[PDB]
Amino acid sequence: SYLGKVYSLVKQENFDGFLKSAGLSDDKIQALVSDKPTQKMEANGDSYSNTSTGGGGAKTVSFKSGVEFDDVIGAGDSVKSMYTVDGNVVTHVVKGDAGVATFKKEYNGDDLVVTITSSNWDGVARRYYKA
Numbered sequence: 045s046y047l048g049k050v051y052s053l054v055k056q057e058n059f060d061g062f063l064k065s066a067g068l069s070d071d072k073i074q075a076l077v078s079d080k081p082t083q084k085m086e087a088n089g090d091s092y093s094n095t096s097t098g099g100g101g102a103k104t105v106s107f108k109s110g111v112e113f114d115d116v117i118g119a120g121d122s123v124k125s126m127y128t129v130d131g132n133v134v135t136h137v138v139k140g141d142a143g144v145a146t147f148k149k150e151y152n153g154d155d156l157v158v159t160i161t162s163s164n165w166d167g168v169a170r171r172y173y174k175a
């Protein structure tokens with residue numbers, strides 16, 4: 045049901061904490077926390093496409109479930125990303141110089157909840173989006 049819908053950020057918790065654990069610069073942290081991103085996912089048979097707007101601009105990237113690839117996320121951070129698509133749960137594992145982070149995306153109707161964990165901190169961050 046989530047395919048083709050645009051989800052917009054409505055609220056977030058502990059996101060600043062998570063970014064600190066990532067060792068990002070203060071200006072990047074400020075820009076990310078102030079962003080009001082949107083995201084739309086599409087299925088293309090063999091691959092999926094994710095279109096995002098906000099900080100770091102507008103982009104559409106394609107990927108296959110289970111395959112790692114070189115990527116750039118956030119405000120220009122270089123990482124190795126790997127997404128696993130399993131029904132209504134999309135898990136994005138990212139490996140960067142700072143460590144590893146997991147972004148668990150759960151879709152339920154018009155709501156999308158993203159739970160984020162990091163290898164450098166014990167807190168849990170949440171991003172709530174609505175279509």
Ligand SMILES: CCCCCCCCCCCCCCCC(=O)O
Nearest residue numbers: 066118140142143144145158162171
């Ligand atoms: C320990 C982290 C290593 C990788 C570095 C990650 C840098 C963080 C910037 C990522 C923001 C991505 C937005 C979260 C995803 C979502 O909201 O759906």
